Design a protein around this nucleic acid. Structure first.
Ligand SMILES: [Mg+2]
Lengths: 100, 1340, 37, 84, 50, 51, 50, 251
RNA sequence: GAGU
DNA sequence: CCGCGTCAGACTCGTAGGATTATAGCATACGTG
DNA sequence: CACGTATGCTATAATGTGTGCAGTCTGACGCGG
């Protein structure tokens, strides 16, 4: 076999579209929501250190501009496959299992 | 009777005088395509239609434009014959005159700027043959007509869509020929919606807002009105008696001074009529009643000028009071009723989120183009361009017509674009249907299903090619120069030619003609298919469309359609049925006026048929008076019953019209179950023509018609006497009265000899006339492959007995006598086609030399110097046909071969071996070879020899043409010269080359000489150009595929004799496989000594319910009995008189024989030729439902001195003793089907394997293994046979090392299993890992 | 050759790189002339 | 690019030829127009031979593709392996 | 029911080979499931002895 | 018959017996001269009446 | 159908009796071709689960 | 692969991969050029679209189509459905030592026999013939034995007759609904191209001779031969496993 | 198109 | 609940090959015998 | 240097897609509002 180095990360469609969502089920994030993030319609908050803005909360393009000046710095919200991968990477399954 | 019928007359048992003869059977195909090419001046048809539809087109800028003038088809570069041989498409070049006109921008419409007019080529269009085929890449192909849902309007409703509720949701669908679909539908809440191209759903009122309708107007359209006058204090309402019906009276209904109904009382008929008779108009009513009535129009306060209430607003006591005091003492509310006049649009307006027209256009725009910012321009443009643009929308005349009649309009034809009325009226009818008045249509009704033939489909694809080129044209016109740019530089032929080639090639409806039988061709071309593009799919097909519909009567055969998944979809046309001008089906009926049945015939469409009551053809006529019986059996509204005589409007023309062509050929169909008859007619199509064309004894009459109309037989254009008969051709000299005064008047028919069919059968035409015989116009001169003296001869009749025989006829199996094989009557001819291609590879060109490594002298003996087998040569599997060699590259020789080739020297040469050889177990005689070389490559010696033949034979053929034309032409001049200056033998003395210098007196006969003189020189110069053409084409170096240097095609002819495993059948759906060929000694034989030919199992009759075969056998025996009586009389040679007496009595036997055949008109010699043919067995015609009855058949048996039972005493050929009881014995006409065991038998030990999966390939032609499928695996698992299973999974399939090891072991005796892992599994893992799933084997 | 069992798990980017014996950086299949890779 | 552009001029020339001849042009007819070798024209037209998918099912019927028929020519034969 | 019972067997090769193959495989891949090849289906797929 | 034979005698006897039955069955079937003509299909006089 | 076929095969059916026969015949024949898939699919599911 | 005619034929996967590579490599270019983010976005969506098409085409939206109109066959399509690897190439396989023909009756046959065309059997038992030819010393080598059987020599008929004795062959008729749709028989060589079937087992096959055909399979190993003779032989398997009734019944 |  | 989506839909045999379009024109640049 | 393959530049103004098809199948089983 060989391989290809992708410049930008990409979602595995089977673990996205093939229901149950798996990726959506794991993040507890509606499928539509994930997709708006992936296709770059809207941003998702990966870590809002300020509890003012919580995790996995979708922001439109103009929503990202408002808190940009206001809070900024202390909230990290991104767009696309990168955002979702990062959100996935940073979720600690043990802890949230016990919480749930 | 005609001259050909004088030779052999069929005896007719029909009783019903045929008012109408069967039409030309290949009507559909020919008429259609004729109309497609036919250049219609005004009423555009086919090609003309396509040009006018698209053209004239203008540029994007609008300054430059292309306009269409006229088109013309070039005559075809290669004729049909040449096309078939070469493998080219038979087509005509399409040249079209076009005019490039340019407008000035500074002048207003300066049309006199630049006008360039010229003729451009753009594609060759395939032409239709004389018999309705197309020749595409050298093979005959037929485009089968299609059947689809007619454009127009259609109302339907899913009967309980939500199964929980089970509420009926009605819908309207407007279906155009070209455009978006427009759907109206109800929802559960009775709100009307609209959808375009079934997108998301929109309130129906939104579309009317697009059409600029305010709320007030919309309600005025769909609703009626209830008026409320407010007088003094009490409220008054304007009343229509028949509104208050089926209701409960809510208040005390009274008028002037009479109280009618009380509170809470049911309003029946009687109350309504009382009220209506009294003439009641206004009624005093309670104010509290209004709460809930919806106001129709807007009302404003004239004082303030503000809205008191908007339209479609529910009224209440406050509003009412307010309205009264503003000064409105009359209020229009919506007439409405839960039951009858349903308030749908009212409720739908409440759901409609749009306000004004513009807002409605935006929402429509936002449906189809969601997300995208709407602009007003774009919304207006979109909506107009959907259904209101000439370009993108077109109902077609058919659509408009069907639509107008569905709406009960008066005007048929009209606009292809939707008008505002049209939409509204469809909504109205939908609403009507919802209320309860009106009914929904069905799709299966032939009034809603339309037939689309070749011409219209070619027209459609041609339009597409035009439209693609149109894009390119507009683009190039915009940027293009006005002056330098020619019109033909912008046009590309490729898109058009591509679209058409792709239709006649890639399309499902275009398929290899089925030609293993005249009937097969004829019925195939009369086929209708619901499949293909713009039609149903097998998957998508339900059961309703498939099944037999009432409308099928007289139009579609109910008994002709495949038992495959194509069961309902493919169907043959009924006999007398025809394509309506708009595309619907229609059937002939005889008009009955006042009981009296006129001979005027009317073709009724499906829709029109429902209107009239039509008597059956079986009704007994009272000698051109009326119906004999007072009660008559008829049908109307799709249902059948008794009527009086005067009530009858029409009657069926023929008894045959219910069935198709195929089914009509089945005699005694009346006594066969339809299942079996379906298979009978289907299998009749697969009958392979035998060596000897035998007519059927027990026929129907349709035999003659089919044969002649199929076109495979050569028939006479003009009657006259036959000047020269030959195996290869027939020259007939025409009679003076029919013979044109121009030409010599001698017709020449070259007969097509031994040629290959698509099913590798043999197509040969035999002459059926004697030299110097007078022949009538439209008589058969030469018989096609399965025809006999003009009649259809698909199989061969023979002596059959029904009885078991030692299980050799177990489950339909057939025991046949050696005699049949000896006489080679079922033996068949097959012409197979083998090709050797010499390609140019990277290493160098392949050569077709006889110089091949490792070839025996025995092999090379039959090959010439070129390396090509000789004509005439017998070959058998393994023999080399065309020697070919290929340049082989390096190969790493194993150390063993290094050592061995060092030992023997024998260093392996540069050339390999790719010679074409006989495929194994086929064996026959090389009857022809054809060679194709490119234009530049030095030709083979054999290729030159073939060209020598062609050139010299072509010269002979053309020379005989001018010779017999010159001879017939001077024979006329000789006669014209006699009319005036008669010197018969004195003119013939000095040579004929110096003849035309002699004239006559200045009269019209002197002008006749000028005409023959002008034509004679014309023929002289014409012969020069014809021969130049011939010579060019023979010399012409063929343009083959790139890479291919030269190709050699060999045609083998194989003689295949019948054997066990071959498949045979009658016409009643009785199949069977030959099990054993019994020696004639063993065959059952009658008292007389005559042995039976076949013994069929009688246990395959009662289950099957095909009794036609038994009737056929009894009638068959009687037919033969009379044949033997005639034969006996001919051998004795009694006298003409005696033969004539017997034969007259015989023809005039039946109770009410239709056809009378008086032998007194026949001259003595004519009687002799007739009897000569009848000796083999007197042929009898049993029409389909008008057939021979038992009484008639028994009477025929008595004339043959045969038993009335038709059972006879038979003796066992083995023992000599008689069988215990009489057996039914007679002649059944049987057929040998295409399914020869030869083609079916296959076996393989080891061979090639598949590419990725590694398991053996499939199919006999690719030397494949059988599939052992999941089903087959489970069998072995059930049994528990573990090793056999594993064997088939591993060593027999993928396991590579295992299979080789196993093979070595088997050759070394030890049957050891050495199994491993199937390679396909490995592949699977890799496919899963390519998916990005880690799937690993954790080992033990 | 002969194993006991089969496991399916998620493919890590790193795991995919392990199977690979080369990175395919070009769409080119073969050469037009010398039909070689 | 060179091959592609060459091939395209062969094509455009073919189009002009076809307009006026009424007939789509032979390899040698195009070659005579360019005053060039027929081998050149032929090789270029061979390169224009466009691909067929191995997976495309055959005969207007979603029955089986080219792969289903296509052999491995290099791989002999338990016969051949056992003979070695 | 028969369909779900077959999908519920611990063998994912049996389940996947039956139907629903895309879903079955996502399930098993995420679970890290291992099939030790007890059933007949499973063995036939790998070309082993029943 | 076959079943009874299987239960009492066993496999081998039944196999032989089955073949034997087949041979004689066909053999007598042929000798009989059994056939199917239009006259066997007897009609009932009470056909018209019932209808 | 409300009107049954009164006639028989030896006597011979008329046009309309034959036509009437067709509906039922064809329905049956189509059922062979089309419904066996569902029968066989049942077989397959049973087999898979057992 | 190159077809004989100079044509090339490729898998759809190669087309799909070519799209992915092109888009990914353009993305690397756009990043090297530091392009504006709207263009970076379009390319990233493009990349995802192509990958998704590669893995499972007609899943997410419109399947990417060929010039034929037909959706390209992606990876998942090769595993999925009937045409998929499992169903088509793994739970069922094409098999060596298999043949097929038209069938006809064999009234004369005994219950454990079937009529097997000579020509068919000659091919099916090819390696056994070669092995025996070498033990007889008639064939010097395998290549010579091959040419000897091609010529179909009279001694080869006698040898073939020797081998087929006591060797069971499997006859199968589709559809194979129950296990008796495959049964084993001792072959009886016959001149003529159709297979002859014993009447009494027509029931089990649902075989009627209106043109039916049957498949022949050769159990190769001593184990398979024994399985056929013991478990699958027609004589041994009389009773329906469904109800306790004899399935071989005169008809 | 061939048996189911 | 409603509505929108995804998933299944018998077994062997056959026939036959095959389709479409178009990318300017010229000067410098890189790699191999 | 040549031959094969590649990279490159061109200057009236031109500045948000569409296009070609899909034809509507069916009874069941889950999944967000
Ligand atoms: Mg059968």
């Amino acid at each position: 076999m060989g391989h290809i180095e992708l410049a930008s990360p990409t979602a595995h469609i089977w673990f996205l579209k093939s229901l149950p969502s798996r990726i959506g089920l794991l993040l507890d994030m509606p499928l539509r929501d994930i997709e708006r993030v992936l296709y770059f319609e809207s941003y998702v908050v990966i870590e809002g250190g300020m509890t003012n803005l919580e995790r996995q909360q979708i922001l439109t393009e103009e929503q990202y501009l408002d808190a940009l000046e206001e809070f900024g710095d202390e909230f990290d919200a991104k767009m696309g496959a990168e955002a979702i991968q990062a959100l996935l990477k940073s979720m600690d399954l043990e802890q949230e299992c016990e919480q749930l | 009777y005609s001259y050909t019928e004088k030779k052999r007359i069929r005896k007719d048992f029909g009783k019903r005088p045929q008012v109408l003869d069967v039409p030309y059977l290949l009507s559909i195909q020919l008429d259609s395509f004729q109309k497609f090419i036919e250049q219609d001046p005004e009423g555009q048809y086919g090609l003309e239609a396509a040009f006018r539809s698209v053209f004239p087109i203008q540029s994007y800028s609008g300054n430059s434009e292309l306009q269409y003038v006229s088109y013309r088809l070039g005559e075809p570069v290669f004729d049909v014959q040449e096309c078939q041989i070469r493998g080219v498409t038979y087509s005509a070049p399409l040249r079209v005159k076009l005019r490039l006109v340019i407008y000035e921008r500074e002048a207003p419409e300066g049309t006199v700027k630049d006008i360039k007019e010229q003729e451009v080529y753009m594609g060759e269009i395939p032409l239709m043959t004389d018999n309705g085929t197309f020749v595409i890449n050298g093979t005959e192909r037929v485009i089968v007509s299609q059947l689809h849902r007619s454009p127009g309007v259609f109302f339907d409703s899913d009967k309980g869509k939500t199964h929980s509720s089970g509420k009926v949701l009605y819908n309207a669908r407007i279906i155009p020929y070209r455009g978006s679909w427009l759907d109206f539908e109800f929802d559960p809440k009775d709100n009307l919606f609209v959808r375009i191209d079934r997108r998301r759903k929109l309130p129906a009122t939104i579309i009317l807002r697009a059409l600029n309708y305010t709320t007030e107007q919309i309600l005025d359209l769909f609703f009626e009105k209830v008026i409320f006058e407010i007088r003094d204090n009490k409220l008054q309402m304007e009343l229509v008696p028949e509104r208050l019906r089926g209701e409960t009276a809510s208040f005390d209904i009274e008028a002037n001074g009479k109280v009618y109904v009380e509170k809470g009382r049911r309003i029946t008929a009687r109350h309504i009529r009382q009220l209506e008779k009294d003439d009641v108009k206004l009624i005093e009513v309670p104010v509290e009643y209004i709460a809930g009535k919806v106001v129709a129009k807007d009302y404003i306060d004239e004082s303030t000028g503000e809205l008191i209430c908007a339209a479609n607003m529910e009224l209440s006591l406050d509003l009412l009071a307010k309205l009264s005091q503003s000064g409105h003492k009359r209020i229009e509310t919506l007439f409405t009723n839960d039951l009858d006049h349903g308030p749908y649009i009212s409720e739908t307006l409440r759901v409609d989120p749009t306000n004004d027209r513009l807002s409605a256009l935006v929402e429509i725009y936002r449906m189809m183009r969601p997300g995208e910012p709407p602009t007003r321009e774009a919304a207006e443009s979109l909506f107009e361009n959907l259904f209101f643009s000439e370009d993108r929308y077109d109902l077609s005349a058919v659509g408009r017509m069907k639509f107008n009649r569905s709406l009960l309009r008066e005007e048929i034809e009209g606009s292809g674009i939707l008008s505002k009325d049209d939409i509204i009226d469809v909504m109205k009818k939908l609403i009507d249907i919802r209320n309860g008045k009106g009914e929904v249509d069905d799709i299966d009704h032939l009034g809603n299903r339309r037939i689309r033939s070749v011409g219209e489909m070619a027209e459609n694809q041609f339009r597409v090619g035009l439209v693609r080129v149109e894009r390119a044209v507009k683009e190039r016109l915009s940027l293009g120069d006005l002056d330098t740019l020619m019109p033909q530089d912008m046009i590309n032929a490729k898109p058009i030619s591509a679209a058409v080639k792709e239709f006649f090639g890639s399309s499902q409806l275009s398929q290899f003609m089925d030609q293993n039988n005249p009937l097969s061709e004829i019925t195939h071309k009369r086929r209708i298919s619901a499949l293909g593009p713009g039609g149903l799919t097998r998957e998508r097909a339900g059961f309703e469309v498939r099944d037999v519909h009432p409308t099928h009567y007289g139009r579609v055969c109910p008994i002709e359609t495949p038992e495959g998944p194509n069961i309902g979809l493919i169907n043959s046309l009924s006999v007398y049925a025809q394509t309506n001008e708009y595309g619907f089906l229609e059937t002939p009926y005889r008009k009955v006026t006042d009981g009296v049945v006129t001979d005027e015939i009317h073709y009724l469409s499906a829709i029109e048929e429902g209107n009239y009551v039509i008597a059956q053809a079986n009704s007994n006529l009272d000698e051109e008076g009326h119906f004999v019986e007072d009660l008559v059996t008829c049908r109307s509204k799709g249902e059948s019953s008794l009527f009086s005589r005067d009530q009858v409007d029409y009657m069926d023309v023929s008894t045959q019209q219910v069935v198709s062509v195929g089914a009509s050929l089945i005699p005694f169909l009346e006594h066969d179950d339809a299942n079996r008859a379906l298979m009978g007619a289907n299998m009749q199509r697969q009958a392979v023509p035998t060596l000897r064309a035998d007519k059927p004894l027990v026929g129907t009459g349709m035999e003659r018609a089919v044969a002649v109309d199929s076109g495979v037989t050569a028939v006479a254009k003009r009657g006259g006497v036959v000047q020269y008969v030959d195996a290869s051709r027939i020259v007939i000299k025409v009679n003076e009265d029919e013979m044109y005064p121009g030409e010599a008047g001698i017709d020449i028919y070259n007969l097509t000899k031994y040629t290959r069919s698509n099913q590798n059968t043999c197509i040969n035409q035999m002459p059926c006339v004697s030299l110097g015989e007078p022949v009538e116009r439209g008589d058969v001169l030469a018989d096609g492959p399965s025809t006999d003296l003009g009649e259809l001869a698909l199989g061969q009749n023979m002596r059959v007995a029904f009885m078991p025989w030692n299980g050799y006829n177990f489950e339909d199996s057939i025991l046949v006598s050696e005699r049949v094989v000896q006489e080679d009557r079922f033996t068949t001819i097959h012409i197979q086609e083998l090709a050797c291609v010499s390609r140019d590879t990277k290493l160098g060109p392949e050569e077709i030399t006889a110089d091949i490594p490792n070839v025996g002298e025995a092999a090379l003996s039959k090959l010439d110097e070129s390396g090509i087998v000789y004509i005439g040569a017998e070959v058998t599997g393994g023999d080399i046909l065309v020697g070919k060699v290929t340049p082989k590259g390096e190969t790493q020789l194993t150390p063993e071969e290094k050592l061995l080739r060092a030992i023997f020297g024998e260093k392996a040469s540069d050339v390999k071996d790719s010679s074409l050889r006989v495929p194994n177990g086929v064996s026959g005689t090389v009857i022809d070879v054809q060679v194709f070389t490119r234009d530049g490559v030095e030709k083979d010696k054999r290729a030159l020899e073939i060209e020598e033949m062609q050139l010299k034979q072509a010269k002979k053929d053309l020379s005989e043409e001018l010779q017999i034309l010159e001879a017939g032409l001077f024979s006329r001049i000789r006669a014209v010269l006699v009319a005036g200056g008669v010197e018969a033998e004195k003119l013939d003395k000095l040579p004929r080359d110096r003849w035309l210098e002699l004239g006559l007196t200045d009269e019209e006969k002197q002008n006749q000489l000028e005409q023959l003189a002008e034509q004679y020189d014309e023929l002289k110069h014409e012969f020069e150009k014809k021969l130049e053409a011939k010579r060019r084409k023979i010399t012409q170096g063929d343009d083959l595929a790139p890479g291919v240097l030269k190709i050699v095609k060999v045609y083998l002819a194989v003689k295949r004799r019948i054997q066990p495993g071959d498949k045979m059948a009658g016409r009643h759906g009785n199949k069977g496989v030959i099990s054993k060929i019994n020696p004639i000694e063993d065959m059952p034989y009658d008292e007389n000594g005559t042995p039976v030919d076949i013994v069929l199992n009688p246990l395959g009759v009662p289950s099957r319910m095909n009794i036609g075969q038994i009737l056929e056998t009894h009638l068959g025996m009687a037919a033969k009995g009379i044949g033997d009586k005639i034969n006996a009389m001919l051998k004795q040679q009694q006298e003409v008189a005696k033969l004539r007496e017997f034969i007259q009595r015989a023809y005039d036997l039946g109770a009410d024989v239709r056809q009378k055949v008086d032998l007194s008109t026949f001259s003595d010699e004519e009687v002799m030729r007739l009897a000569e043919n009848l000796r083999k067995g007197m042929p009898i015609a049993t029409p389909v439902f008008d057939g021979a009855k038992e009484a008639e058949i028994k009477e025929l048996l008595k004339l043959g001195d045969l038993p009335t039972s038709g059972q006879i005493r038979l003796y066992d050929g083995r023992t000599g003793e008689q069988f215990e009881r009489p057996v039914t014995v007679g002649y059944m006409y049987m057929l040998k089907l295409n399914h020869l065991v030869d083609d079916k038998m296959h076996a393989r030990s080891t061979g090639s394997y598949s590419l990725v999966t590694q398991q053996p390939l499939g199919g006999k032609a690719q030397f494949g293994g059988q599939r052992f499928g999941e089903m087959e695996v489970w069998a072995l698992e059930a049994y528990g046979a573990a090793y056999t299973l594993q064997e088939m999974l591993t060593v027999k399939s993928d396991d590579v090392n295992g299979r080789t090891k196993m093979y070595k072991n088997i050759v070394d005796g030890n049957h050891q299993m050495e199994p491993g892992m199937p390679e396909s599994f490995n592949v699977l893992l890799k496919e899963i890992r390519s998916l990005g799933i880690n799937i690993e084997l954790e080992d033990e | 050759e002969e194993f006991d069992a089969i496991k399916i798990a998620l493919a890590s980017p790193d795991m995919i790189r392990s199977w690979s014996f080369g990175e395919v950086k070009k769409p080119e299949t073969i050469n037009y002339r010398t039909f070689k890779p | 690019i060179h091959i592609v552009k060459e091939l395209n001029v062969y094509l455009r020339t073919a189009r002009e030829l076809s307009h006026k001849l009424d007939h789509e042009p032979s390899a040698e007819e195009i070659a005579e127009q360019l005053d060039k070798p027929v081998d050149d024209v032929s090789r270029m037209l061979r390169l224009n031979e466009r691909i067929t998918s191995v997976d495309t099912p055959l005969g207007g019927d979603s029955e089986k593709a080219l792969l289903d028929i296509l052999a491995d020519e290099k791989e002999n034969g338990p016969e051949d392996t056992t003979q070695d | 029911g028969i369909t779900k019972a077959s999908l519920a067997t611990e063998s994912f090769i049996s389940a996947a080979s039956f139907q629903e193959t895309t879903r079955v495989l996502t399930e098993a891949a995420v679970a890290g499931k291992r099939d030790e090849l007890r059933g007949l289906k499973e063995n036939v797929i790998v070309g082993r002895l029943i | 018959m076959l079943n009874t034979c299987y239960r009492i005698l066993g496999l081998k006897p039944t196999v032989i017996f089955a073949d034997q039955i087949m041979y004689t069955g066909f053999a007598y079937a042929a000798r009989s001269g059994a056939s199917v003509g239009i006259d066997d299909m007897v009609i009932p006089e009470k056909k018209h009446e019932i209808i | 159908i409300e009107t049954p076929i009164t006639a028989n095969f030896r006597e011979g059916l008329n046009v309309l009796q034959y036509f009437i026969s067709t509906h039922g015949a064809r329905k049956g024949l189509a059922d062979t071709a089309l419904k066996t898939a569902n029968s066989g699919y049942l077989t397959r599911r049973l087999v898979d689960v057992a | 692969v190159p077809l004989d005619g100079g044509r090339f034929a490729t898998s759809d996967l190669n087309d799909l991969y070519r799209r992915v590579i092109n888009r990914n490599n353009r993305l690397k270019r756009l990043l090297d050029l530091a392009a504006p983010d709207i263009i970076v976005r379009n390319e990233k969506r493009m990349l995802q679209e192509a990958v998704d098409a590669l893995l499972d085409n007609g899943r997410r939206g419109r399947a990417i189509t060929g010039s034929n109109k037909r959706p390209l066959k992606s990876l998942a399509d090769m595993i999925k459905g009937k045409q998929g690897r499992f169903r088509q190439n793994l739970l069922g396989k094409r098999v060596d030592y298999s043949g097929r023909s038209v069938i006809t009756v064999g009234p004369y046959l005994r219950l454990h026999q079937c009529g097997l065309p000579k020509k068919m059997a000659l091919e099916l038992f090819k390696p056994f013939i070669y092995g025996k030819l070498e033990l007889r010393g008639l064939a010097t080598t395998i290549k010579a034995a091959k040419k000897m059987v091609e010529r179909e020599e009279a001694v080869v008929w006698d040898i073939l007759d020797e081998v087929i004795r006591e060797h069971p062959v499997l006859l199968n008729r589709a559809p194979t609904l129950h296990r008796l749709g495959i049964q084993a028989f001792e072959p009886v060589l016959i001149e003529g191209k159709a297979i002859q079937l014993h009447p009494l087992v027509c029931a089990a096959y649902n075989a009627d001779f209106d043109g039916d055909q049957m498949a022949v399979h050769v159990p190769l190993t001593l184990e398979a031969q024994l399985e056929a003779r013991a478990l699958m032989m027609s004589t041994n398997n009389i009773l329906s496993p469904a109800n306790g009734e004899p399935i071989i019944v005169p008809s």
